[PDB]
Amino acid sequence: SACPSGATCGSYTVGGLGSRKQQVRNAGGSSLDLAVAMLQTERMDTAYPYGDNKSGDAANFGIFKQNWLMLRSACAQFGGQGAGQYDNGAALNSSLGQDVSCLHQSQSHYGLDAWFAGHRNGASGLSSPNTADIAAYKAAVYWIKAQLDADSANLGNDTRFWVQVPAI
């Protein structure tokens, strides 16, 4: 209900989102995964600009906006690949199952603390993971997760819960 430490937050309806939440869950997404996805886009989709307008290791793919550094470091299907091969990450834009599998491989590779740091701030986050900005990003995700956990209707309805987290 009340927003996380100083932040703006709220909720609104997105047509079709409930059916999409169900698809994400059936692909293996947990409530934490749904909260991460919910922060990134409204419809849990990949129609955002290619790479989220970033190239190389910072390029974002899939519904979670995973970056290429983390994908190539953690996920078997990208093993051994380099920063310049980032266009290969676009496979996740058309395969939800692979997107979720890669998310789980990445979270296990890093552990969740480091994972949040890299997911928010890339290589700079991995080497400086305990910043105020990373903590606020994590807090936003866990606040969204709390809304999902508090009422299971939110796992399948059209409601989007959000916290304003400035883009970087």
Ligand X SMILES: *[C@@]1(O[C@H]2[C@H](O)[C@H](O)[C@H](O)O[C@@H]2CO)O[C@H](CO)[C@@H](O[C@@H]2O[C@H](CO)[C@@H](O[C@@H]3O[C@H](CO)[C@@H](O[C@@H]4O[C@H](CO)[C@@H](O)[C@H](O)[C@@H]4O)[C@H](O)[C@@H]3O)[C@H](O)[C@@H]2O)[C@H](O)[C@@H]1O
Q: How many residues bind Cl ion (CB under 5 A)?
A: 2
Under the criterion CB under 6 A, does residue 124 sit at the interface with ligand X? yes
**Identity of residue 118:** G
Query: For residue 86, which of 100, 110, 70 has the smallest C-alpha distance?
Result: 70
Minimum gap (Å) between residue 48 Cβ and ligand X: 7
Residues 48-107 binding ligand X (CB under 6 A) are 52, 54, 57-58, 60, 65, 67, 69
Q: From 109, 22, 12, 92, select the one nearest 50 (Cα to Cα).
A: 92
| Per-position b or e across 74-112, b if 16+ CB within 10 A of its CB | bbeebeebeeeebeebebbbeebebbbbbbbbbbeebee
**Angstrom distance (rounded) from CA 133 to CA 121:** 9
Is residue 46 involved in binding ligand X (CB under 6 A)? no
150 binds ligand X (CB under 6 A): no
Binding mask 13-42 for ligand X (x = CB under 6 A): --------------------------xxxx
Per partner kind, with CB cut-offs from 5 to 8 A, the member of Cl ion, ligand X, none near residue 8 is: none
Q: Candidates 19-27, 86-94, 95-103, 158-166: pick the segment binding ligand X (CB under 6 A).
A: 158-166
Tokens of 70: 């983390």
Interface contacts to ligand X, rule CB under 6 A: 39-42, 52, 54, 57-58, 60, 65, 67, 69, 119-125, 162-168
